[PDB]
Design a protein around this ligand. Structure first.
Ligand SMILES: OC[C@H]1O[C@@H](O[C@@H]2[C@@H](O)[C@H](O[C@@H]3[C@@H](O)[C@H](O)O[C@H](CO)[C@H]3O)O[C@H](CO)[C@H]2O)[C@H](O)[C@@H](O)[C@@H]1O
Ligand SMILES: [Cl-]
Length: 413
């Protein structure tokens, strides 16, 4: 029996995973046993397995975790699998770079599925506000003027019978910079930069502060209600679904969720699901970026089932499994060839995610990435708390990212 650990990638994820692997099981005369870890906990259990030598054969990883787990020395080389799937050629570079610890000789993860972030919008709220989405999502200035028109609008969701918040974004200490990265990048900033053979914080670069301040100050100007500042990602998701928000940033999953009854983990019933639009991040002063992520699969080098686990990695990474699991999850395949399936191309909301991928940007794949993102989100949490007071100024934000930067630079030395 092979053991795979996965995250909750679909409404019934163990059952979707098991339907996905049934033909591998039949062709190999083997049973796969799946365990589903919540995203909130999956980090700790995966790190405990890596530290103790007790764990599955395969584990899903966040693309941004592959570096740290690889540096713990517990991942089996999978260059052989990536070759059987078509090698570097078979992947966007953004995806290809997630297959290894930055600068390591050997690949240690197999790309499974991709996700990137774009804005969902209420077509009804924007039509009623008189906002042309092409203009609002073209530029930072067009975005700010579309929120202003959304704030002034008479519109009220027909279910809630109240106004929509123009923008909903969470102010709770985030787990990651996924929401914030597009604004840092669009200003010409970065989280860390490589120069003179070392990585250092760029979160206190004037470009980073411009981007971050522009994002956080929207909330300060009235385009994000005080209630949103008190919420985490999952709560903002729920708020868009329940008709409280006209615009918010998420992954492609919400498209397949909008086509699924409430009773099945969806909101097809709700207005928002009937009035659903997608648009890319607006271009910033120094170009157009969005966070590009997903999950890879890794094999623990203490696995007793390496040969079969490798066949399972080639099965899951290959074209048929890639198409099939992207359809159940609402994600994108990791494999470029699999994007051509009509199931992705003739879905007009998903087609927008596909166009957005041109401007997908990734984290460098560093052993210490986790430590970096954790001090950054701590300081960014304190910034959100100043926005909850009306008291985020450029000075206070610079003071917080200087402290983040000094604590990030220690971590990297
Ligand atoms: O930072 C770790 C890791 O984060 C990954 O982002 C995930 C999101 O992909 C995930 O989205 C969930 C869907 O996957 C699932 O199907 O639906 C639920 C609700 O129905 C969604 O929340 O949410 C988690 C928790 O916030 C995020 O961590 C990145 O893609 C990966 O690149 C990164 O390494
Ligand atoms: Cl944020």
């Amino acid at each position: 029996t092979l053991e795979v650990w996965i995250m909750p990638n679909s409404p019934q994820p163990a059952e979707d995973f098991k339907a996905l692997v049934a033909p591998f099981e039949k062709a190999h005369g083997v049973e796969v046993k799946v365990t589903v870890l919540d995203w909130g906990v999956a980090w700790t259990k995966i790190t405990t397995a890596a530290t103790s030598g007790v764990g599955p054969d395969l584990t899903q990883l966040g693309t941004t975790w592959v570096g740290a787990i690889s540096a713990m020395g517990v991942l089996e080389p999978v260059d052989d699998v990536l070759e059987a799937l078509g090698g570097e050629k078979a992947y966007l570079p953004a995806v290809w770079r997630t297959t290894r610890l930055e600068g390591a000789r050997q690949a240690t993860a197999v790309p499974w599925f991709s996700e990137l972030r774009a804005f969902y919008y209420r077509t009804d709220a924007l039509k009623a506000a008189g906002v042309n989405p092409a203009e609002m999502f073209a530029s930072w200035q067009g975005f700010e003027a579309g929120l202003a028109r959304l704030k002034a609008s008479s519109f009220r969701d027909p279910e809630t019978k109240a106004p929509l918040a123009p923008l909903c974004t969470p102010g709770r200490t985030p787990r990651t910079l996924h929401n914030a990265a597009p604004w840092i990048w669009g200003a010409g900033g970065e989280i860390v930069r490589q120069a003179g053979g070392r990585w250092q914080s760029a979160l206190n670069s004037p470009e980073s502060l411009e981007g971050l301040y522009f994002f956080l100050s929207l909330a300060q100007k009235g385009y994000v209600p005080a209630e949103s500042l008190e919420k985490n990602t999952a709560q903002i998701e729920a708020d868009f679904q329940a008709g409280k928000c006209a615009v918010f940033a998420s992954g492609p999953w919400m498209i397949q969720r909008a086509q699924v009854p409430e009773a099945k983990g969806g909101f097809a019933e709700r207005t928002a699901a009937k009035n659903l639009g997608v648009a890319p991040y607006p271009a910033g002063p120094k170009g157009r970026y969005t966070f590009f992520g997903g999950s890879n699969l890794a094999l623990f080098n203490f696995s007793k089932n390496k040969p079969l686990a490798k066949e399972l990695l080639k099965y899951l990474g290959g074209p048929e499994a890639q198409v099939r699991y992207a359809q159940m999850t609402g994600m994108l395949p990791a494999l470029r060839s699999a994007w051509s399936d009509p199931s992705f191309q003739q879905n007009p909301l998903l087609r927008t995610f596909i166009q957005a991928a041109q401007f997908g940007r990734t984290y460098p794949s560093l052993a210490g990435w986790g430590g970096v993102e954790n001090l950054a989100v701590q300081h960014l949490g304190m910034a959100w708390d100043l926005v909850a007071q009306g008291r985020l100024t450029r000075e206070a934000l610079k003071d917080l990212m200087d402290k983040a930067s000094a604590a990030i630079n220690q971590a990297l030395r």
